[PDB]
Structure 1
Amino acid sequence: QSQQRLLLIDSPLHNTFLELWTMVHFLVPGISKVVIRLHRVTQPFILRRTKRDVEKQLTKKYEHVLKCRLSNRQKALYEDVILQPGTQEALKSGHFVNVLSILVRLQRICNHPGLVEPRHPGSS
């Protein structure tokens, strides 16, 4: 028992008019170029909008890419890695994808020498 009804939907399907007709019927029980006419028929009961409204609508996102050079240890490790038998692997010698991924991972962890090269105390 209700005098009014309100429905929320993210987005409906274009084709498969069965669902649209069923929804329109269940909105109110008083009903028994293609896309253009379909939209024209759904004019009296429709209210849709796009995300173009977000422009200047308090939606303020900021991203700043900061460039940072490498340290002497990082330079040394990078030169060592690139200057290794892996050169032939980097030149597509065998298992290209695997060796490329391995080299990418190595260079990735090389962003800090403490990871690949753990500095340890010089006990006596």
Structure 2
Amino acid sequence: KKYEHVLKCRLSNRQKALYEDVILQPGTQEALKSGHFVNVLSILVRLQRICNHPGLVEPRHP
């Protein structure tokens, strides 16, 4: 038997900061306005990697 669950997780403030930084960078806005498959793919490989854990995009150094 199979039971399906989808759980919504609220992103942290550091995640929110990196997310807004990546989105509001002009290199993302120009791609959104004009369009390019590789650019949108790169934008997601950034943003979803942030969304998993911000330590993969900027780790906390000692």
TM-score, length basis structure 2? 0.71
Structure 1 gap ranges (5+):
1-59
1:79 aligns with 2:20: yes
% of aligned pairs identical? 100
SS at match of 1:119: coil
Give the direction of change, closer, same or farther, for the CA distance of 1:115–1:72 in structure 2 (3 Å limit): same
Post-superposition Cα deviations, 1:84-122, rounded to whole Å, max 9, x if no partner, equal 02233332425344334433543334421110001110x
8 A Cα contact 1:74 1:113, kept in partner: yes
Structure 2 gap ranges (5+):
none
Which residue of 1 is the match for residue 33 of structure 2?
Answer: 92
More helix by share: 2
Give the C-alpha shift of residue 72 in structure 1: 0.7
8 A Cα contact 1:110 1:116, kept in partner: no
SS at match of 1:110: helix
TM-score, length basis structure 1? 0.41
More strand by share: 2
**Which of structures 1 and 2 has the bigger CA Rg?**
1
Post-superposition Cα deviations, 1:14-46, rounded to whole Å, max 9, x if no partner, equal xxxxxxxxxxxxxxxxxxxxxxxxxxxxxxxxx
SS at match of 1:118: coil
State the superposition RMSD in angstroms. Answer: 2.3
- With CA pairs under 8 Å and 6+ residues apart, which has the higher RCO, 1 or 2? 2
8 A Cα contact 1:90 1:99, kept in partner: yes
Post-superposition Cα deviations, 1:48-68, rounded to whole Å, max 9, x if no partner, equal xxxxxxxxxxxx211100110
